[PDB]
Scaffold this active site. Structure first.
Site, short mmCIF file in Angstrom:
data_model
loop_
_atom_site.label_atom_id
_atom_site.label_comp_id
_atom_site.label_asym_id
_atom_site.label_seq_id
_atom_site.Cartn_x
_atom_site.Cartn_y
_atom_site.Cartn_z
N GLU A 1 -65.65 -63.02 44.90
CA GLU A 1 -64.46 -62.79 45.30
C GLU A 1 -64.50 -60.83 45.36
OE1 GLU A 1 -63.24 -63.38 47.23
OE2 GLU A 1 -63.19 -65.93 47.44
N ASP B 1 -60.20 -57.32 53.44
CA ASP B 1 -61.23 -58.56 54.00
C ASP B 1 -62.33 -58.66 55.06
OD1 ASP B 1 -60.35 -60.67 54.90
OD2 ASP B 1 -59.42 -61.94 52.50
#
Ligand SMILES: [Cl-]
Ligand SMILES: [Cl-]
Ligand SMILES: [Kr]
Ligand SMILES: [Kr]
Ligand SMILES: [Kr]
Length: 162
Positions: A11, A20
């Site tokens: 991540e 994202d």
């Protein structure tokens, strides 16, 4: 290697709100703020999460706190999921980490849907299940990550992470 190290590799770590791959507002180590387009909405959600006026920026410390929480909630969700819990319990520790990774990334829900693989995973049919998980939007959207996770699941080693 452990789950924290593993998801931290998958991540990353960002201190300022970002979008994202899906284009959703997020911060820290994979901490989704919101699905809404509103960057304002996003700062609000952030402020509420941290307990202060961040103004879209957090410290490392703050980021690691959301992350501890998020890992924790991921595990607890698994353990309260009836589909999930039994697969989990049947797994060795590396493989458990792989499941948590997927759950953190996709929710109990999105994970709930790998029934076909997960059954094979409950069955210890490493290869079969791996190939089936590959037939997924998940894999097509983030093939490199998907690959690491599926390899860990299949092998039960951290090779993919070295
Ligand atoms: Cl929160
Ligand atoms: Cl990826
Ligand atoms: Kr799976
Ligand atoms: Kr797998
Ligand atoms: Kr899998």
């Amino acid at each position: 290697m452990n789950i924290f190290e593993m998801l931290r590799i998958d991540e990353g770590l960002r201190l300022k709100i970002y979008k994202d791959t899906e284009g959703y507002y997020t911060i820290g180590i994979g901490h989704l703020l919101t699905k809404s387009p509103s960057l304002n909405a996003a700062k609000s959600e952030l402020d509420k999460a941290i307990g202060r006026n961040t103004n879209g920026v957090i410290t490392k410390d703050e980021a690691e706190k959301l992350f501890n929480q998020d890992v924790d909630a991921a595990v607890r969700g698994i353990l309260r999921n009836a589909k999930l819990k039994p697969v989990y319990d049947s797994l060795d520790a590396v493989r458990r980490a792989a499941l948590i990774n997927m759950v953190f990334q996709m929710g109990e829900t999105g994970v709930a849907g790998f029934t076909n693989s997960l059954r094979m995973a409950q069955q210890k049919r490493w290869d079969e299940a791996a190939v089936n998980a590959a037939k997924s939007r998940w894999y097509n959207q983030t093939p490199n990550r998907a690959k690491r996770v599926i390899t860990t699941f299949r092998t039960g080693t951290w090779d993919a992470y070295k």
